[PDB]
Design a protein around this ligand. Structure first.
Ligand SMILES: CCCCCCCCCCCCCCCCCC(=O)OC[C@H](COP(=O)(O)OC[C@H](N)C(=O)O)OC(=O)CCCCCCCCCCCCCCCCC
Ligand SMILES: CC(=O)N[C@@H]1[C@@H](O)[C@H](O)[C@@H](CO)O[C@H]1O
Ligand SMILES: CC(=O)N[C@@H]1[C@@H](O)[C@H](O)[C@@H](CO)O[C@H]1O
Ligand SMILES: CC(=O)N[C@@H]1[C@@H](O)[C@H](O)[C@@H](CO)O[C@H]1O
Ligand SMILES: *[C@@H]1O[C@H](CO)[C@@H](O)[C@H](O)[C@H]1NC(C)=O
Ligand SMILES: OC[C@H]1OC[C@@H](O)[C@@H](O)[C@@H]1O
Ligand SMILES: [Mg+2]
Lengths: 814, 324
């Protein structure tokens, strides 16, 4: 029970009036961001491979793993810290606002963040309240003001609050100074409808007048003040304690369904890498078991390397293959997954189909980390008053596209039951011939009578019936019996029976739903038998708890307030703009990053397979097949652009034919591209190709001469014939998967094949003084000086693209 | 907004190719039609090439070159008779091969000083540290440091033709011209300056296993040190455990007579290089070449097995998609 003083003067333990819609502060950014970075199995593996390389002495330097790691972690930290600095500016244009105050017989004008509990604020018509005021007087007599909390509890009507009879006659800011009162309130609670306080205005001689307060006097925060000149409140709750800010649930870490697949792919490539490094060490020491298979008198060991303990070289030999095959687990796919996530979130801001003339602004992007999971939603938990409403422009022809695409639209509101049921009847969510299963408080006026009907309409009424035949209707009173009272009775769990009628009905409508009961519905559905990607598109301050609880929460830039367009991930200034955000922007955003992660493991398993098969023809001595300038340039220079320019400006279904046709959305639904069927085709097509690059060059090198002058090649011409077949095969495997050939896909696909052929002809061809090796001097200009090496490179590029081509003739018919 | 450009609105003009099944059937046929005439053109070429490889590593009690698998007095000697039933027509190329010899070994491939073999005045005296074991002896820096240069192949293979008389006529082998033009005239250079090569190597020593220093490899000022063909050819690692390295070449005669007339030949070798310690073979290989290289039937039987699996898959996929 806090005691607040009227004029903040006598007749400090309170929070500060401030809004925090961001995640990181300035102190807990690194401790909190890094932890979010190491949820990726590749940032953890490469921090262990770097920590072992700094405590033991290995033939490799700690810069092979530390340099990439400390670049992926500072690239995804400048974007996560910049995208969250903009959320520090959205709250800056609201906290640093203007709100006047009767400080000392003078109408001071502080900011909306410098208000302290116990100072007489004043609000003007149409001005929302900055904090939880307590009406002390209204301009007019009768001490009554009209407030509309259409954003706090979905109710659109005008509520009428009362003043304090002891101060109805106080105005002009000069009498408010002669007011000595003590307000004993209740500690801030989220009930939103209860309140208990006391006022004990102290007169000069003696006055114990105690006009007890109530919910009729408290003027909440976020409720507009309509039809009144001005008022004179006395702040009591001051932000983060206001009843509006106690119904926020708390930010969490949102990661799409593709960021969870990159970790299921990184766990089968962590066993493909510990089986390579372990099959090459189990064999490297049965091979060396012969006395003349190590130290064969033509290469002898140094005195140092001869004394090393054999039990420590079995470990540094293993750890030396992992570092040789560690390209299999790409950490250059995180520098491209974030460069594409940041530069692709601009197509939602730049879209002109999201521009609202009468508010003069378009879509928003609060986070780019979920672009790819807009095209993967299964449930959409909308709001009624303000977002669906008289219906809006196309809030009924948009619910027909969300039902044709296979989505399930639930209307979670906070208004009346039937009044809401009407505006969902109106929106054509409950058609005329749709058997309504009403679980409201109008049919369940008991505690046990619910069970007598819960299974009376599922075990015998719903399954024994289809789509439009039945639709549900619930409340906030009844839904508390199914949730709270049903956490003990587990013989036949209510929540189990109930949660079967919801996944069997066309659409559901929940009325009188508190701000923290729309987050329990979004949580019940997030757990049932899978991981249904849930969306939540609201517009007020009661839809901020179901927007922080869904997989991707949209927010509407409405008129009431922007409390949901700040705690959301995106923000369209209309509900009808959701058909183009999911159907046309989530279908492209997903198919672009689902093909960038399929092609980033393929890309690198064709690279390191021809280098693991070499160890059988070397002495298992972990000798790289390729040059050293070719290993590092592959993932960054030779193969990095063609896939970037694809994941950014490639539309495999025209963007004008997936907005109209809404059934192409269920083609990709369920993580179609990153499943186990498409994964076993990119992994087996990369072990079939990586085996054709090597064993197609191993059979070509049985000639004793590959040119007309009878000259022999070394091991660096063997490695650039397997690297030239490799670059043309992984670059022409994307030129075959491309359906949108912009002028930027013509310049990076043929400009990356004309750069490997120009860099090679240039890197080799000069005696570089700064190098200590000069081993690739003319390995490329001579490799291409033989006719048998051309006919052999154009036959291994076709034997490798035969699967990808035969699949185009079979899969592309019927 | 006023940013409704073709790029920002995702409406850049594109190509959008529809790779259907009805315009890919003429592919499997245009391929199988230009791969069978190739696989057949480069498969008869790989057959007209004449080649003979005689093994002389001993390891056999009835092997002429077995009397010095472990000789008491060096140098050894051994003659081996082969028979050319069909004379060699063009200019032939004499090789030498080695099995179980891992020149592509991490601890071996990296055992050279590429800046020292390039005429660097400073590297000649203080060689690198990668050629460590063979980097210094007698407190002096080995001139060709490393293992790749210390284990140079040093057998002396000579050929003779047993003419109509019992006396054999030795065929002339051409030594110079067997190393990449680039890595002999550019990449392999002698030390910086001097008149005679015996000086440029002052503070250097000869490799441990060699008999004569690098400035006495050959009596040809352009084939003497660091540019010796036999040396430049050995220093190019093999990429596999069984390799061939060009040794000599037998220019074709100005007349029309063959380069190696059919008959009985003598291959008398000075057995110096021990290759049995590690179960390695050692052979000689004569051969003629063609635009394609040597005798390898992989490209021949690979262009037909890929140009004739298409011509078929192009038909089946034209009879199954022909029902409709
Ligand atoms: C110039 C010659 C160099 C010769 C070097 C010879 C000596 C090498 C010694 C080797 C020891 C280590 C040296 C330092 C290593 C640097 C590593 C580095 O900078 O990583 C930066 C990252 C990651 O790289 P990675 O190759 O994917 O390796 C990851 C792997 N897991 C690993 O173990 O390490 O990579 C990325 O961050 C990916 C960036 C993707 C975005 C695309 C950028 C485009 C760049 C420009 C492309 C030009 C293309 C031209 C096109 C022509 C016009 C069309
Ligand atoms: C059989 C053998 O090892 N030695 C003979 C040798 O006496 C003679 C020579 C020329 O015909 O052919 C061989
Ligand atoms: C590897 C081998 O066969 N051992 C000998 C070695 O003892 C001898 O010193 C060298 C010439 O000096 O030739 C070789
Ligand atoms: C140059 C010569 O005639 N004899 C050497 C011999 O000392 C050495 O042992 C062998 C390689 O080990 O190469 C030969
Ligand atoms: C070739 O080898 C034979 C083996 O009898 C030996 O006389 C000599 O080294 C060579 N013979 C001639 C005639 O040059
Ligand atoms: O037998 C092993 C040989 O090692 C090197 C050689 O120069 C001699 O010192 C010695 O005879
Ligand atoms: Mg609302």
């Amino acid at each position: 029970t806090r005691t607040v003083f009227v004029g903040n003067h006598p007749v400090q333990r309170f929070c500060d009036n401030r809004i925090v819609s961001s995640k990181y502060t300035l102190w807990n950014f690194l401790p909190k961001n890094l932890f979010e970075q190491f949820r990726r199995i590749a940032n953890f593996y490469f921090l262990i491979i770097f920590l072992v390389q700094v405590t033991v002495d290995t033939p490799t330097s700690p810069v092979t793993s530390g340099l990439p790691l400390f670049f992926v972690i500072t690239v995804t930290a400048i974007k996560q810290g910049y995208e969250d600095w903009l959320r520090h500016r959205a709250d800056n244009e609201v906290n640093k606002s203007t709100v006047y105050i009767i400080e000392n017989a003078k109408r001071v004008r502080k900011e909306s963040e410098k208000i302290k509990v116990g100072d007489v604020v004043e609000v003007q018509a149409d001005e929302t309240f900055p904090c939880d005021l307590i009406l002390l007087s209204s301009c007019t007599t009768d001490g009554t003001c009209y407030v509309t909390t259409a954003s706090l509890d979905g109710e659109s009507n005008c509520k009428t609050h009362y003043a304090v009879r002891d101060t109805i006659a106080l105005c002009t800011a000069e009498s408010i100074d002669t007011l000595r009162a003590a307000i004993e309130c209740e500690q801030p609670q989220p009930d939103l409808y209860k309140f208990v306080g006391r006022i004990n205005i102290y007169s000069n001689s003696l006055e114990a007048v105690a006009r007890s307060l109530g919910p009729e006097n408290l003027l909440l925060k976020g409720a507009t003040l309509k039809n009144t000149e001005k008022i004179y409140g006395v702040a009591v709750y001051t932000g983060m304690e206001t009843k509006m800010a106690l119904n926020y649930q708390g930010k969490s870490q949102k990661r799409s369904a593709v960021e969870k697949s990159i970790n299921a792919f990184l766990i089968v490539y962590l066993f493909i890498l510990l089986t390579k490094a372990a099959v090459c060490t189990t064999l490297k020491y049965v091979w060396q078991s012969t006395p003349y298979n190590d130290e064969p008198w033509y290469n002898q060991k140094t005195q140092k390397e001869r004394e090393t303990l054999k039990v420590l070289k079995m470990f540094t030999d293993f750890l030396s293959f992992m570092v040789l095959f560690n390209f299999i687990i790409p950490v250059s796919m995180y520098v491209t997954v974030e460069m594409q996530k940041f530069l692709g979130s601009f197509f939602i801001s730049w879209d002109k189909d999201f521009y609202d003339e009468e508010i003069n602004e378009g879509a928003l992007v609060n986070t780019s980390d979920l672009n790819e999971e807009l095209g993967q939603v299964d449930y959409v938990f909308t709001d009624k008053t303000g977002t669906l409403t008289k219906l809006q422009d196309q809030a009924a022809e948009t619910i027909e596209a969300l039902h044709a695409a296979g989505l399930k639209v639930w209307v979670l509101t906070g208004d009346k039951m039937e009044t809401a049921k009407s505006t969902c009847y109106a929106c054509r969510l409950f058609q005329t011939n749709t058997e309504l299963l009403e679980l409201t408080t109008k049919t369940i006026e008991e505690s046990e009578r619910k069970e007598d009907r819960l299974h009376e309409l599922l075990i015998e009424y719903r399954k024994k019936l289809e789509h439009q035949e039945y639709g549900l209707i619930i409340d906030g009173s009844t839904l508390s019996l199914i949730l709270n009272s049903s956490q003990d009775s587990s013989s036949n769990n209510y929540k189990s029976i109930f949660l079967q009628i919801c996944m069997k009905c066309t659409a559901v409508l929940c009325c009188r739903m508190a701000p923290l009961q729309k987050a329990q519905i979004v949580r019940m559905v997030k757990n049932l038998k899978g991981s249904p990607i849930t969306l939540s598109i609201g517009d007020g301050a009661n839809d901020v708890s179901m927007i922080l609880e869904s997989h991707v929460g949209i927010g509407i830039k409405g008129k009431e307030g922007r409390q949901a367009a700040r705690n959301s991930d995106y923000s369209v200034p209309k509900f009808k703009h959701l058909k183009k955000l999911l159907l046309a922007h989530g279908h492209l955003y997903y198919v672009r990053i689902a093909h960038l992660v399929q092609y980033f493991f393929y890309k690198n398993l064709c690279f390191i397979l021809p280098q693991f098969l070499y160890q059988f023809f070397c002495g298992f001595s972990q000798q790289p097949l390729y040059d050293a300038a070719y290993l590092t340039m592959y993932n960054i220079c030779f193969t990095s652009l063609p896939i970037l320019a694809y994941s950014l400006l490639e539309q495999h279904i025209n963007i004008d034919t997936l907005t109209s046709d809404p059934r192409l959305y269920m083609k990709i639904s369920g993580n179609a591209m990153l499943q186990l069927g498409p994964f076993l085709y990119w992994t087996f097509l990369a072990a079939f190709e990586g085996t054709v690059f090597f064993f197609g060059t191993y059979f070509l090198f049985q000639t004793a001469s590959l040119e007309e002058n009878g000259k022999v090649y070394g091991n660096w011409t063997f490695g650039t014939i397997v690297f030239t077949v490799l670059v043309f095969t992984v670059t022409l495997k994307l030129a075959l998967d491309t359906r949108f050939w912009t002028w930027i896909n013509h310049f990076v696909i043929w400009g990356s094949l004309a750069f490997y052929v120009f860099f090679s002809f240039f890197w080799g061809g000069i005696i570089w003084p700064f190098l200590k090796q000069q081993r690739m001097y003319f390995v490329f200009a001579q490799m291409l000086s033989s006719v048998s090496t051309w006919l052999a490179i154009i036959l291994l590029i076709f034997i490798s693209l035969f699967p990808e081509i035969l699949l185009i003739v079979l899969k592309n018919v019927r | 907004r006023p940013d409704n450009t073709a790029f920002k609105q995702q409406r850049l003009p594109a190509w959008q190719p529809i790779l259907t099944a009805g315009t890919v059937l003429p592919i499997f046929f245009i391929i199988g039609l230009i791969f069978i005439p190739i696989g057949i053109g480069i498969f008869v070429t790989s057959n007209n090439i004449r080649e003979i490889e005689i093994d002389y590593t001993g390891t056999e009690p009835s092997s002429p070159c077995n009397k010095c698998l472990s000789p008491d007095v060096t140098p050894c000697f051994c003659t081996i008779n082969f028979t050319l039933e069909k004379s060699f027509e063009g200019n032939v190329f004499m090789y030498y091969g080695l099995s179980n010899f891992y020149q592509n070994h991490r601890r071996y491939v990296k055992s050279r000083d590429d800046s020292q073999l390039n005429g660097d005045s400073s590297a000649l005296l203080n060689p690198s540290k990668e050629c460590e074991p063979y980097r210094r002896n007698e407190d002096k820096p080995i001139a060709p440091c490393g293992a790749i240069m210390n284990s140079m192949f040093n057998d002396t293979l000579e050929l003779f033709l047993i003419g109509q008389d019992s006396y054999p006529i030795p065929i002339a082998l051409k030594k110079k011209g067997i190393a990449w033009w680039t890595d002999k005239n550019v990449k392999f250079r002698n030390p910086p300056g001097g008149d005679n090569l015996e000086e440029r190597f002052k503070g250097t020593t000869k490799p441990v296993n060699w008999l004569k220093p690098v400035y006495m490899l050959d009596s040809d000022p352009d084939n003497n040190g660091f540019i010796n063909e036999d040396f430049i050819v050995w220093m190019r690692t093999a990429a596999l455990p069984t390799f061939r390295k060009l040794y000599r070449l037998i220019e074709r005669k100005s007349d029309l007579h063959p380069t190696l007339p059919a008959g009985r030949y003598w291959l008398n070798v000075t057995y110096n290089y021990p290759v049995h310690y590690f179960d390695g073979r050692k052979r000689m290989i004569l051969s003629t070449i063609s635009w394609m290289g040597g005798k390898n039937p992989f490209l021949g039987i690979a262009y037909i097995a890929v140009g004739s699996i298409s011509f078929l898959l192009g038909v089946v996929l034209l009879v199954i998609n022909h029902k409709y």
